[PDB]
Paper text:
The recently identified bacterial Sir2 domain-containing protein, defense-associated sirtuin 2 ([name]), recognizes the phage tail tube and depletes NAD+ to abort phage propagation, which is counteracted by the phage-encoded DSR anti-defense 1 ([name]), but their molecular mechanisms remain unclear. [name] forms a tetramer with its C-terminal sensor domains (CTDs) in two distinct conformations: CTDclosed or CTDopen.
To elucidate the molecular mechanism underlying [name]-mediated [name] inhibition, we first purified the [name]–[name] complex, which showed no NADase activity, and then determined a cryo-EM structure of the [name]–[name] complex at a 2.5-Å resolution, in which approximately 60% density was observed, facilitating the accurate tracing of [name] and CTD domains. Further 3D classification resulted in a map containing almost all parts of [name] at a resolution of 2.6 Å. Each [name] binds to the CTDopen of protomers 2 and 4, with the binding pocket of [name] located on the backside of where the tail tubes bind. This binding of [name] is distinct from the preference of the tail tube protein for CTDclosed in protomers 1 and 3, resulting in a [name]: [name] ratio of 4:2. This observation suggests that the pocket in CTDopen in protomers 2 and 4 is better suited for [name] binding than CTDclosed of protomers 1 and 3. Taken together, these observations indicate that binding of [name] to CTDopen in protomers 2 and 4 allosterically prevents the binding of the tube protein to CTDclosed in protomers 1 and 3, thus preventing the tube-mediated activation of [name].
Numbering used by the authors:
A (entry chain D): 336 to 463, 467 to 495, 501 to 565, 579 to 636, 644 to 897, 911 to 1005
B (entry chain F): 11 to 126
C (entry chain C): 15 to 74, 79 to 462, 468 to 629, 645 to 670
Write the structure that this text describes.
């Protein structure tokens, strides 16, 4: 405690009352003339001292601070996700016990926890400065904790996996029975406990309590943002460059989640506060992208998107982010295209894999890279984590910064054709947690091209017969992609005889234009309902207002459904029967069409004004704000 | 009613319950629920009007609604606690004045959309 | 084994108890004999005697013959021949038997052994334990670690030489002369620790020598060492009493289990495995025992006015989750559930009378503590849980005059001064607070530690205020205010210059460190860590709920934040800790309330303000903090 060593590298005299050695050392560093006054032994010691301080980013005192450059550089293959390189490093024969320690962290990082536990046990045997011995004891206990946690997780949960043999599980329990990590530091040689007092915190259960409590300042509404960020980088560099397995535990991942989020929200608050007074902050880099990808869950990113506006946050080192994104997408191909899936390495990596591509919306990607991410996401991502419904959203997010070109369109077309290929089986059915299916991908291509025709799908459509019904109705959701010959061939398999077939046709996109026949079919259903008076009725009303129907014989059935007459004739509609709940069910196009009608507008703007004042509903407020309905 | 959550972006209720319903064709379904998907930026056709797309699941499998889906609730069972909750569902069904009042889970596609 | 424990003799279970408590306390030492080494097929000394006999007379034993024939061989054949036979017999590799692993699994403070092999050494390296191995005179001074692996008879690390080891006669004769430091170290370890003899026969020479020295010690000045007897036959009753009076507490393996004559490994394991599995077991069976165990954990907390419920999981070593709503949940208690049994006695009045006369009043003291602290029952017995929030502190309620009068009264106990010092701090008389806290430290051990913490905290407050007043106080006030004289500043600087708050807990008697583990978190901001992590987690959860427009019918999500907020305020104020003035603690209170009001406003348009809520915002919010809420 003789000095403060600030995160920007400035030393401050704190508590020492003797000679100022740190001030004297920096004077020796700046000018070389006094350096020659030292003895030869002290000259080489100063060079070693000078190397340590420049490598650790401690440059000078506070009062000599000038143009400070605090750029985070983590020299660790594990942090960058260089999965191939660490495999090669593990494969090579290790020269020294320091290389073994790096190997065991890499084995732990690659899901080979049994091998790292054996390696850490080996290092402990051969290492009795004794600093690697202590660090291996910390890491072996940490990996034993990870193995025990993974065994419990796997027993609770898609298929039954047994990554660790029960012989290995029984062995590590007998080696780690009644093992105290708390007594580890105290039982070390007294020379170690003096020289390496700063390593004691690794034996504690929690070591980021100080960093988490200091995060409270980021919520102050009255630099510090640089202090929290540099403190975060300090924790990352120490835990990764020194190869400590605690960097993969829940406490550290949550701490990065808390510190990164609060830094983002604080910068968001500063921007809005600035605009309030100035009337028109956080700049992410490659390391921030990795930190969000590795440590944030998809829900945690979602809490970020709703609270703040990351689209206002500018992303730097996009080629390094792209290299990270092409580098990660390569590993998915290795994990699933081949039989190289490591079930333990699976659990940790897929969460980072999902988060990186979800966060890849905000980064500009080159075409060659974008092909690799898209092809790895579309084809090689297992359906258990990213199903058909969620995968399009990951794919569709990449279009925010990268407007879909031809090459990516081909890949999605490849995906669509492969989706048609799996439909030869009648049992096969797409399972989506988002209510979102293969039709949405084709809509995306038609959105970005408006003229793309799927040749291979046309071949599959033309080959179709009446037998394989699962293929027929699947491609009816892909009608715009088919050619005219394929369109004519497919339409022969369905009929529009009764009203129900019309609704099925309108839902699957079988027909998009109303010939006069369906109007009569539309008309016939309504007279039956009118006769039987003493779901669809509201649906028909919208189509008349949307100019989908020009039969003009719609007013005969005015008086049954309050939504029907509300759409057929807004001028004559009574708005005391109006319910504000409808506007919540209406999409972008319909609400905008109501806004420009010049009828119904002042009534609904009054109902929306009443609702927000009485209830303060954000959906009502945003519906009123965006379209002025 | 302790797991019961009201979403206000769509005036529906989230509840871990199943439904035993009969349509207008006397067909019976047992242990069925619904899921709603708020996707305001969906690439709509010329004839898409509803902001939410709903999938009905029975026996863990989704249904292809080829006919009219007008239906009445005959028995609603809360999954976590087997107490019959049908009276609450019908009471809630009348109030919200919206299609498919009680839904197993709502999926919000707005926050994940690139145009968000 | 669990069955074997059930009908274990009451004496053996008591013997198992004291061994286990010593192992937890870190003061267990194992005296390992040749029997454990023989289990690993190490060359027994009787075959060394046989070889020496063959090379002496040509044809192949009392107690002294084991010592005399090697001495005869050493005298007439020489040192080279004696060590030559030593090398070709003892230079072998042998695997460590599981008993070596089980000995280390007991976590012994030191390992004293008469074996000259390295079997314990390699066993220690395989396990990862670090022991400073001492087998010669110079190793005692050059020991690098507190933990000692004491080979009192030497070993062959220097070489397979007769001088390095105590093997023959004239090595046992001159043992005290050639090993004064090692013998002193062994006696010192035995005096200060609890000793378990394993691998030794009851008639072993070393056991008698140690028992001979033990009789010299005055009555009850030493702990009676523990002896693990692994002879195939059950110990005779008359022999047992003889050695118990000599000073040994004998654990007989042959009496514990039925075993074969030559199956020594099962005999050693049956006691080692019973010892190992008793580490987690609480020896908890009857209701009187259950109250006794819970009382031992809770009774030290009676010194404190209030205990945070989240802190109670540390008292019982993560056995349970103590929820802020007052519900107890099984977390890591694999043994008998004493908390369930405790509340079963609480709800059922008839079973309370079943308890003994002592355990009845101990339960009553536990009942008042658990009711005062807001611990009700388990989660599965939870009903309508509504607890009013109340803080019995004058500092919290702003009764400045009442606290001023309280200082004027004469103190009747040491807790009276401790409350007075906190009130002096809350009234800005930090000088009177510091020297008062200094007086409590002199006359004080719960109050001692808390006064030291508060004195350091008030010292930091004075130093910060002095720096402010010197640097900005002249400009802020228009006058250079001098509330503290340089004599006061110099004196508090001198005393607190070498004081470290981090080692204050570690620099305490082990009884304090185990009874008051929850107080260690007060040295730093670690006591706020769990609530800070929880607050950040629910804040994201709550804000996500409001963002999506969801409303939940039933329990409100911020009730965890609401209860944790008053858990810290009640703990810090009623215990009179100066942490209430922490800038970080103020931020924690400000963030918790701000989340509560935002959720209430979100729920209002779909919680109300009390006297306690008004004080929290008044004390812990800045003006810009309140303005932010009024905007939103």
């Amino acid at each position: 405690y003789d000095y403060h060593f600030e995160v920007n590298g400035t030393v401050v005299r704190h508590k020492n009352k003797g000679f100022g050695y740190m001030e004297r050392f920096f004077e020796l560093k700046e000018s070389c003339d006094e350096r020659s006054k030292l003895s030869k032994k002290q000259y080489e010691r100063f060079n070693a001292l000078f190397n340590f301080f420049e490598k650790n980013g401690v440059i000078c005192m506070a009062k000599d601070a000038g143009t400070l450059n605090t750029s985070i550089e983590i020299n660790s293959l594990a942090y960058h996700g260089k999965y191939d390189v660490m495999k090669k490093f593990i494969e090579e024969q290790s020269v020294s016990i320091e290389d073994d320690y790096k190997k065991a962290f890499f084995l732990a990082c690659l899901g080979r926890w049994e091998e790292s536990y054996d390696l850490y046990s080996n290092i402990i045997l051969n290492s009795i400065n004794g600093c690697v011995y202590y660090l291996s004891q910390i890491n072996r206990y940490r990996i034993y904790q990870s193995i025990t946690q993974a065994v419990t997780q796997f027993n609770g949960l898609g298929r039954h996996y047994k990554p660790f043999t029960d012989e290995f599980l029984a062995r590590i329990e007998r080696e780690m029975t009644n093992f105290n990590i708390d007594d580890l530091f105290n039982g070390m040689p007294f020379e170690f406990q003096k020289k390496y007092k700063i390593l004691e915190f690794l034996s504690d259960n929690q070591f980021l309590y100080d960093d988490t409590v200091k995060l409270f300042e980021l919520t102050n509404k009255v630099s510090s943002d640089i202090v929290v960020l540099l403190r975060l980088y300090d924790n990352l560099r120490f835990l990764y460059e020194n190869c400590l397995w605690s960097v993969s535990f829940h406490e550290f991942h949550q701490y990065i989640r808390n510190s990164m989020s609060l830094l983002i929200e604080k910068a968001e608050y500063e921007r809005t506060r600035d605009i309030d007074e100035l009337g028109f902050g956080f700049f992410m880099e490659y390391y921030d992208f990795v930190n969000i990808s590795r440590h944030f869950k998809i829900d945690d990113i979602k809490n970020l998107e709703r609270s703040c506006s990351i689209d206002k946050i500018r992303f730097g080192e996009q080629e390094k982010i792209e290299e990270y994104l092409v580098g990660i997408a390569e590993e998915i191909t290795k994990q699933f295209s081949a039989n190289g899936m490591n079930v333990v390495f699976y659990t940790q990596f897929i969460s980072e894999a999902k988060a990186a591509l979800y966060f890849a919306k905000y980064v500009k990607l080159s075409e060659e890279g974008l092909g690799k991410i898209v092809k790895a996401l579309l084809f090689y991502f297992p359906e258990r984590d990213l199903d058909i419904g969620k995968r399009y959203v990951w794919l569709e997010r990449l279009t925010k910064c990268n407007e879909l070109p031809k090459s990516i369109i081909s890949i999605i077309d490849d995906f669509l054709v492969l989706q048609a290929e799996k439909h030869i089986d009648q049992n096969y059915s797409e399972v989506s947690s988002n209510g979102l299916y293969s039709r949405d991908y084709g809509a995306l291509i038609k959105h970005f091209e408006k003229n793309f025709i799927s040749k291979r799908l046309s071949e599959i459509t033309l080959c179709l017969t009446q037998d394989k019904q699962k293929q027929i109705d699947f491609l009816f959701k892909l009608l715009p992609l088919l050619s005219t010959n394929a369109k004519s061939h497919l339409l022969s398999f369905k009929s529009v005889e009764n009203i129900n077939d019309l609704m099925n046709g309108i839902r699957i996109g079988l027909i998009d234009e109303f010939t006069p026949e369906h109007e009569e079919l539309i008309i016939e259903y309504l007279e039956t309902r009118k006769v039987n008076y003493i779901d669809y009725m509201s649906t028909f009303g919208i189509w008349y207002f949307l100019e989908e129907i020009n039969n003009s014989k719609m007013e005969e059935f005015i008086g049954m459904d309050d939504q029907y007459d509300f759409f057929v004739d807004p001028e004559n509609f009574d708005y005391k029967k109006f319910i504000p709940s409808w506007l919540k069910n209406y999409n972008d196009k319909l609400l905008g069409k109501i806004a420009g009608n010049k009828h119904m507008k002042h009534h609904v703007i009054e109902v929306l004004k009443e609702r927000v004042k009485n209830s303060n509903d954000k959906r009502y407020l945003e519906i009123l704000m965006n379209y002025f309905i | 009613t302790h797991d019961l959550v009201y979403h206000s972006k769509i005036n529906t209720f989230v509840w871990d319950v199943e439904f035993d319903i009969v349509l207008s064709d006397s067909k019976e379904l047992n242990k069925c629920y619904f899921v709603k998907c708020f996707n305001p930026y969906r690439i709509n056709g010329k004839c898409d009007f509803a902001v939410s797309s709903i999938d009905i699941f029975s026996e863990g499998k989704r249904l292809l609604i080829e006919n009219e889906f007008n239906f009445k609730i005959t028995k609603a069972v809360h999954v976590a606690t087997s107490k019959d909750v049908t009276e609450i569902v019908l009471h809630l069904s009348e109030r919200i004045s919206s299609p498919f009042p009680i839904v197993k889970e709502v999926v919000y596609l707005d926050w994940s959309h690139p145009q968000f | 084994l669990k069955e074997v424990f059930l009908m274990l003799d009451n004496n053996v279970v008591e013997c198992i108890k004291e061994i286990t408590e010593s192992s937890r306390n870190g003061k267990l030492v194992f005296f390992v004999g040749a029997g454990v080494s023989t289990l690993s097929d190490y060359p027994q000394w009787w075959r060394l005697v046989d070889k020496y006999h063959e090379e002496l007379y040509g044809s192949p034993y009392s107690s002294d013959e084991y010592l005399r024939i090697p001495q005869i061989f050493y005298n007439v054949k020489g040192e080279m021949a004696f060590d030559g036979i030593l090398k070709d017999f003892f230079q072998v590799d042998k695997p460590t038997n599981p008993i070596h692993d089980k000995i280390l699994a007991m976590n012994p403070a030191h390992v004293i052994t008469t074996n000259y092999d390295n079997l314990i050494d390699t066993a220690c390296w395989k396990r990862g334990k670090y022991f400073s191995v001492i087998s010669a005179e110079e190793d005692v001074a050059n020991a690098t670690s507190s933990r000692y692996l004491l080979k009192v008879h030497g070993d062959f690390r220097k070489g397979f030489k007769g001088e390095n080891v105590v093997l023959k006669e004239d090595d046992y004769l001159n043992y005290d002369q050639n090993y004064p430091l090692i013998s002193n170290l062994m006696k010192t370890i035995i005096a200060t620790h609890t000793i378990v003899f394993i691998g030794y026969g009851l008639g072993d020479y070393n056991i008698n020598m140690l028992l001979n020295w033990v009789r010299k010690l005055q009555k009850d000045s030493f702990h009676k060492p523990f002896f693990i007897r692994t002879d195939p036959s059950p110990i005779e009753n008359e022999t047992l009493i003889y050695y118990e009076n000599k000073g040994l507490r004998i654990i007989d393996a042959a009496s514990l289990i039925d075993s074969n004559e030559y199956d020594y490994l099962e005999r050693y394991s049956a006691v080692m495995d019973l010892l190992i599995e008793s580490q987690e077991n609480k020896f908890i069976t009857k209701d009187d025992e259950v109250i006794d165990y819970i009382y031992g954990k809770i009774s030290p907390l009676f010194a404190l006015q209030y205990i945070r419920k989240i802190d109670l999981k540390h008292v019982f070593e993560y056995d349970y989750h103590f929820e802020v709503n007052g519900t107890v949940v099984r977390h890591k208690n694999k043994g008998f559930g004493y908390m369930e049994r405790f509340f079963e006695l609480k709800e059922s009045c008839d079973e309370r009378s079943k308890l003994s006369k002592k355990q009845y009043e101990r339960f009553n003291a536990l009942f008042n503590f658990f009711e005062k602290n807001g611990v009700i029952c388990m989660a599965k017995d939870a009903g309508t849980l509504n607890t009013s929030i109340e803080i019995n502190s004058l500092a919290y309620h702003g009764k400045y005059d009442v606290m001023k009068k309280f200082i004027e009264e004469q103190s009747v106990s040491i807790e009276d001064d401790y409350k007075k010092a906190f009130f002096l701090a809350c009234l800005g008389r930090w000088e009177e607070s510091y020297d008062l806290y200094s007086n409590i430290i002199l006359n004080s051990g719960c109050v001692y530690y808390l006064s030291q913490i508060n004195r350091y905290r008030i010292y930091q407050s004075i130093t910060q205020a002095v720096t402010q007043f010197n640097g900005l106080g002249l400009l802020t006030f228009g006058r250079h205010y001098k509330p503290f004289t340089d004599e006061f500043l110099a004196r508090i600087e001198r005393e607190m210059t070498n004081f470290n708050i981090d080692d204050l807990f570690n620099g305490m008697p082990f009884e304090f460190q185990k009874k008051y583990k929850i107080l260690e978190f007060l040295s730093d901001n670690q006591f706020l860590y769990d609530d800070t992590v929880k607050l950040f987690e629910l804040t994201n959860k709550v804000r996500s709920e409001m963002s999506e427009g969801s409303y939940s019918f039933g329990m409100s999500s911020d009730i965890v934040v609401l209860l944790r907020l008053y858990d810290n305020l009640r703990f810090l104020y009623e215990n009179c800790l100066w942490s209430v003035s922490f800038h970080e603690f103020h931020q924690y209170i400000r963030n918790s309330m701000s989340l509560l009001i935002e959720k209430a406003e979100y729920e209002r348009t779909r919680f109300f303000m009390e006297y306690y809520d008004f004080v929290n915002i008044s004390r812990h919010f800045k003006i810009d903090d309140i303005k932010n809420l009024e905007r939103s």
